[PDB]
Design a protein around this ligand. Structure first.
Ligand code: GTP
Ligand code: GTP
Ligand code: GDP
Ligand code: GDP
Ligand code: MG
Ligand code: MG
Lengths: 435, 429, 429, 435
């Protein structure tokens, strides 16, 4: 009776959703066709139920290119989703923000909002929104900005959580990533309650070093992000000794209206062969979470300060050990919070252990911990994007596409001003107080 | 007679209440179904004080379970010793406080407080002679803090004569389970020092320390901590739920322990606390209990008493014992720790003795110390609040629900005044 | 009444204590579980002096086991006659003294001495009328020496009136089980002559010699040596743990044997000592015991008494005997060895008689001689210390823990002064 | 709860460790896969334990050439070690100190320290360090010097014990042994608490004469040194009538900060056929230990004085016999200690007899004794090395490799000065005192 819908925009969102809903259907013992042969209700929060034993997800898969959605319709998860939700456009934004926010997406935004409204009104205790969207793709940035503005107009005060794919510092598949990123950030900065920074480069690094797989496909990154999402929602979806709802997330991890970009982290991530040879202490996994090499965003936390942290544990966990481990973490100097926030933790414990997906890469563990940490190091990352933007704007490169697709240069200048203001705010907060 | 009404706010309050009712039912010999299967009539001679005899000879606890999220409520409902609460009692909302006090006291709470007060009124009219209210809640969680303060204010409006008990789980000094807990603590303390008769401060840190060192348990689950707090509460009420050579009631404790209207914050303590193995290697005598109860390593509030003075002390024993022995022990302990007591309160040990052990044991004891050391606690919190207010961090969440800064200014000033009063009376002469 | 508290420091102290408590329990008829299964009420008439009657009718020794490495502690715990010590007593550290005195008295000991003193204080307040303390430790091992000296200093600070007993295993003259033992011996002796009432010097060499020649044992395991020292200690305390025609207490021995504040080092001795076969071929009469107890070949301290004079002598018998016989024997032995006693102390034989044999015999006897011969011992050690200090060998280990040379200078000067006093009184006239 | 980690540097260290951990796994009834079908805990001091019945060693096998470590990973002891510890470099120091201390090892020293820190923090009563490293090899000398400096910086006051392989006077497999030896000694002279001199030549001699094997492989020398190590640690790992911890070792056998080079010795060493025909008296085995032909360093003790000795017995031993034997040893004139140390012994007794490794060479004995003796004869050995160095430096031979690999000639001159100073100190201590 605490419902929460999922909205997947763009190819990244759709594939991540494939992984996430595979994970869920595995968790609650749900067959791909919605049937099912500590649990409570549990699945009601994400699965609505029809008359028969068939459950359907509360997901809205929207895209402008029918390729990936068609793959979904043809995949093993064909019987599952409500066929009306799988909204497909005709011509994708083609990595162009203007197309994804002014020209094309403007013609199916209404249908998407209609399906959203139907799903919302069929629910009673709606908690909030989960937008799964990338940052570089045109559909992702543009359509997500449009959709967030529309929802914020419609649903005045409700939780709105995003899982952006922050553009990596050195590996970029697109060429216009700075433009899409800056525009979508300038838009979503006033509507998204709490984003969730994740990058592909860091996940490549983690897969190579920790899991000992040298050649990972997007399937593996998707599985990892799905595990993170499942750990986020395990509080709603299960009985825990200290539960937490998404409103608690936005209250705890967001000190100021604008600074709401916490980065994700998960532990333990160890291969099946290395599953033994370590007992996986909860203090050990806490240390793993705080290890700068385990974060899922290519930013060294040591260059900034953790303004807030939220650690969600699951499995056979005992609160005293968590208290001891967090005390130890607070003792060390290399992990230096801001002076003005003396209490830098929210703790949540769940009774259900993480479940390993068959054919997966990780090993069956009894304890797991997902850290959502809002720090100041991420600020430097913005600088990089800013820098890129400046160069690609100093020559007015690629500007003609956006200009001719329903946008003006003054908008680019304004978004640059907004990003500069955000960087200024991060720097100002990073300093210490007097007296 | 002297029936007591139980209120449970916030998730911690509800879990503590579940364990508490388990303990009470074990005391009176009550089956999980709610029917009496006990063996001693004295169980039923005062069964009415906490229970109501429903028809067909059943018993229902006088509980009023309140929350804003149905999760923990349903957990209680499904689990054993949940099937005897009267199902109409489970008041719960849908929005959830979101760990915010503004939601828990202004926006969300304003929609359920009316139904809660209505069920309260029904239970009050049901009772013969109401004795008082005991509220079990937190101070960090939004629901607990906000809604409990609102309920306390409303009840005190509608019953300015009854007596008020609160078991508020104070935030621990070292760890911080939440991030905005200074704000919730300050606002809740403002309301409490406004309209409460007594407040039983508890920290999870001290309970961790006790379960670790004294009980020799490396795996303290929340069940055990709640079990300890439940044993403390049962010890507090057994003075009237049971006969005794020197009986006590809640009003007696309130009169004895509260010299001034504001200074009514007590730290509890329990004894004996013996590990599974280290029990048969110790003698269970009144001197042993008495000496156990006076030390920092057995105070359920994380603050050394030695840093201040005991303004007053109450001590409730159980099981068959000799009064002269207790008197001698109290005399000795008041003699040797002369610097640990306030000069201008001679003979500052209130004593009560019951006749029934808390099950399984020969004799137990409960300590309720109103000291000046707790000022440190408030000091700590106050400072934290100040810091998080100097930058106005997290301020927007609370501002967006109608509350404004001047609320925080007044609350902080009030808490500082309270600390000043504690300091003044600590060094009085 | 007159309860005695037992402290065990260092590995040797702990092993000796294990054997000692085995012996005592055998005396009072105490099962390994700690419950009494004896047959004679006199066992329980004074059972309180060393034991505490824990509830459910059990008995726990008044022991305080101290160490810095959990090894020997766990060995004691696992072995039989370990399951009755009160488990909260086993105080131990993790660093280990590393056979260093600086660690055992300044760095590592400063972290556990507080807990040790706290348990000491608890036991003291538990007792009715404290009689005194007996400390069982070494002089070579770092833990024993350092921590025992620290505990003695602290206790003497907190109880300047009680009486103090130490069973210090002095290093042997010929062999040297350690390498730095002169330093530990000198520092420990400095502390002891500062703040001890009596010190029972023992050497492993003499025990080896006794187990070899007198007992006719070619395989003396440490169990046997500890058994002998335990029998000596039991003989010392039986004068008050049991009725007697002429009873004695620890204070009596202290007054009789210690003419001057500093000169309080005693060499013990035991009798009879008969091999397994050579027993039935000898008569067990008081003259036989008395003549056995006066010879170098039965002194548990490796130094011939003939090289000096007996300043004083105490003699504690057991079992049923005739007082006139004892008096006659003491008269004869004081007559024929006139040159072996100091001129200016007439009638220098303190006598005590118990009524119970040490289990398995008709009559036994314990000798406690305060002589001047022991000066040689100190002489020896002093010289060794001097040598190892002239080159400042091994000095860096002790310097690195805060101690400096002037400590060693003062300690050596103090020991030389003590030897000078012994020499002066040996040739007094 | 008295933990002690082992660090194996270089090929010599790794093979010696193979032998040592084979011996341990045999002692405590530990299968090669960490399972196990007077004992206490005992194994806790060296074996950490995971949830299952699987125990893992506290060892850190580090090398710059992956050959030997790969052999370990492929050997029967594959399942045992925690795979993260088996740190392998890429290009070995190639018997060059500069490579092993400035160029190559500088790039994995951080990973080694990280694993060390993890293993240390997972322990509670950490006693100290066991470095198993040779003296001639480049990796051994250079990497060990670097690692000792780093650990001494990190762990301020803890036990640090080394098992060096002193370069033989006449059998030298390397050609630059004097350079590596002098450099590593000048470095480790200020950090190692107590080294442990052992040589291959003496062990060859012992194997030929006593064990009556004329053709021994490195396996046999490794087994002997493993037996010595096991006798050293039997006090920690077992219940004994007079136990002793490593701090006691460094306190007893080290009179001065610099002179801390005690040589090892073990007894009895007799073949299976000669096991009978002698009852193996404890006095007999003591005499065997003091026999100049049984020491494991090619130095005649009669040319110097035993400044200190430490005899660790194990098996069916009785203290009186030990006292008698040591008294007799003190009586004889050919064993002449220094005048200023009148007490030249530390004695330790253990209850557990030594266990013979199946397929081994020694015979099942009931009593054993390991002597660690710090004497003055070893001083002459330094002279020999010094002499060699002088010659190989008089022509500046081989200097170009070290110069071009991150080192200067002034460093060579300084190390020579330091070795001369050490020899001077040994000579000065060897003299007698006046008055
Ligand atoms: N983590 C993760 N990221 C993905 C995956 N597939 C695509 N992406 C991200 O998608 C980005 C490409 O832009 P998209 O958002 O996919 O563009 P789109 O969704 O196809 O929409 P258009 O821009 O209109 O084409 C890349 O930067 C990738 O990081 C995936 O399987 N896992
Ligand atoms: N006792 C013993 N010594 C060995 C054994 N194997 C090699 N050594 C010693 O190793 C020395 C050779 O130098 P190493 O330390 O092995 O060089 P490394 O370990 O391969 O490292 P690099 O110098 O970089 O190649 C020789 O002097 C041998 O004495 C062995 O099995 N037992
Ligand atoms: N003693 C105890 N305290 C608890 C327990 N569960 C939660 N708490 C405390 O309750 C606080 C959380 O308040 P909660 O009721 O869960 O949040 P709310 O819904 O906003 O009221 C935390 O500070 C915890 O310290 C428990 O089982 N025992
Ligand atoms: N009589 C006796 N003496 C012992 C025994 N064990 C050890 N010792 C002596 O105790 C000394 C060692 O001290 P120890 O307590 O083991 O070292 P520590 O840990 O630093 O205190 C040695 O000089 C031994 O002579 C024993 O069983 N009996
Ligand atoms: Mg696309
Ligand atoms: Mg090599």
């Amino acid at each position: 009776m605490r419902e929460c819908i999922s909205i997947h925009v763009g190819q990244a969102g759709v594939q991540i959703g494939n992984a996430c809903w595979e994970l869920y259907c595995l968790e609650h013992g749900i067959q791909p066709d919605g049937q099912m042969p500590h649990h409570h209700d549990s699945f009601n929060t994400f699965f609505s139920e029809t008359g028969a034993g068939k459950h359907v997800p509360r997901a809205v898969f929207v895209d402008l290119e029918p390729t990936v959605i068609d793959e979904v319709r043809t995949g093993t998860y064909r019987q599952l989703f409500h066929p009306e939700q799988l909204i497909t456009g005709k011509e994708d934004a083609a990595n162009n923000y203007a197309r994804g926010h002014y020209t094309i997406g403007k013609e199916i935004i209404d249908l998407v909002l209609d399906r959203i409204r139907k799903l919302a009104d069929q629910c009673t205790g709606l908690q909030g929104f989960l937008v799964f969207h990338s940052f570089g793709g045109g559909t992702g940035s543009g359509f997500t900005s449009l959709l967030m503005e529309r929802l914020s107009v419609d649903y005045g005060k409700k939780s709105k959580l995003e899982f952006s794919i922050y553009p990596a510092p050195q590996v970029s598949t697109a060429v216009v990533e700075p433009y899409n990123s800056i525009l979508t950030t300038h838009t979503t900065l006033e509507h998204s309650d709490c984003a969730f920074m994740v990058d592909n480069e860091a996940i490549y690094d983690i897969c190579r070093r920790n899991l000992d797989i040298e050649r990972p496909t997007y399937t593996n990154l998707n599985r990892l992000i799905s595990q993170i999402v499942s750990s986020i929602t395990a509080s709603l979806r299960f009985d825990g000794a200290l539960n937490v709802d998404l409103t608690e997330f936005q209250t705890n991890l967001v000190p100021y209206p604008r600074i709401h970009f916490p980065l994700a982290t998960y532990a333990p991530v160890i291969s099946a062969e290395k599953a033994y040879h370590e007992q996986l202490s909860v203090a050990e996994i806490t240390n793993a979470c705080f290890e700068p090499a385990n974060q899922m965003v290519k930013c060294d936390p040591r260059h900034g300060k953790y303004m807030a942290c939220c650690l969600l544990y699951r499995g056979d966990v005992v609160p005293k050990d968590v208290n001891a481990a967090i005390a130890t973490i607070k003792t060390k100097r290399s992990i230096q919070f801001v002076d003005w926030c003396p209490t830098g933790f929210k703790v949540g414990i769940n009774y259900q252990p993480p479940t390993v997906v068959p054919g997966g890469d990780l090993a069956k563990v009894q304890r797991a911990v997902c850290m959502l940490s809002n720090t100041t190091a991420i600020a430097e990352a913005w600088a990089r994007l800013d820098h890129k933007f400046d160069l690609m704007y100093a020559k007015r490169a690629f500007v003609h596409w956006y200009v001719g697709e329903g946008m003006e240069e003054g908008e680019f200048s304004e978004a640059r001003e907004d990003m500069a203001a955000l960087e200024k705010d991060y720097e100002e907060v990073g300093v210490d107080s007097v007296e | 007679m002297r029936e007591i009404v139980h209120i449970q706010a916030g998730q911690c309050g509800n879990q503590i209440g579940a364990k508490f009712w388990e303990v009470i039912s074990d005391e009176h010999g009550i089956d999980p179904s709610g029917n009496y299967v006990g063996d001693s009539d004295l169980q039923l001679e005062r069964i009415s004080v906490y229970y109501n005899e429903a028809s067909s000879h059943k018993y229902v606890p006088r509980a009023i379970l309140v929350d804003l999220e149905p999760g923990t409520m349903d957990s209680v409902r499904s689990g054993a010793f949940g099937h005897l609460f009267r199902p109409d009692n489970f008041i719960f909302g849908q929005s959830g406080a979101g760990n915010n006090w503004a939601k828990g006291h202004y926006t969300e709470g304003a929609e359920l407080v009316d139904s809660v007060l209505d069920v309260v009124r029904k239970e009050c009219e049901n009772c013969d002679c109401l004795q008082g209210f005991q509220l079990t809640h937190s101070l960090g969680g939004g629901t607990g803090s906000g809604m409990g303060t609102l309920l306390i204010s409303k009840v005190r409006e509608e019953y300015p004569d009854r007596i008020m008990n609160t078991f508020s789980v104070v935030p621990s000094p070292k760890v911080s389970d939440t991030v905005v807990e200074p704000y919730n603590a300050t606002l809740s303390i403002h309301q409490l020092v406004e309209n409460t008769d007594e407040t039983y401060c508890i920290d999870n840190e001290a309970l961790y320390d006790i379960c670790f060192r004294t009980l020799k348990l490396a795996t303290p689950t929340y069940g055990d901590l709640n079990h300890l707090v439940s044993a403390t509460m049962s010890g507090v009420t057994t003075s009237l739920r049971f006969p005794g050579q020197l009986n006590a009631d809640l009003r007696k404790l309130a009169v004895n322990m509260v010299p001034f209207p504001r200074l009514h914050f007590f730290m509890p303590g329990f004894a004996p606390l013996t590990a599974r193995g280290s029990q048969q290697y110790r003698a269970l005598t009144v001197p042993e209990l008495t000496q156990q109860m006076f030390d920092a390593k057995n105070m359920m509030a994380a603050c050394d008493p030695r840093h201040g003075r005991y303004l007053t002390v109450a001590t409730v024993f159980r099981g068959r014992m000799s009064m002269k022995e207790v008197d001698e022990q109290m005399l000795a302990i008041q003699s040797k720790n002369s610097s640990y007591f306030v000069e201008w309160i001679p003979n500052n040990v209130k004593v009560a003795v019951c006749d029934i052990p808390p099950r399984g044991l020969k004799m137990s004891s409960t300590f309720i110390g109103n000291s000046t050391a707790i000022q440190e606690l408030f000091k700590r919190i106050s400072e934290q609040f100040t810091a998080m207010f100097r930058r106005k961090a997290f301020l927007h969440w609370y501002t967006g629900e109608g509350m404004d800064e001047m609320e925080f200014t007044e609350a902080e000033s009030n808490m500082n005044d309270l600390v000043s009063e504690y300091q003044q009376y600590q060094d009085a002469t």
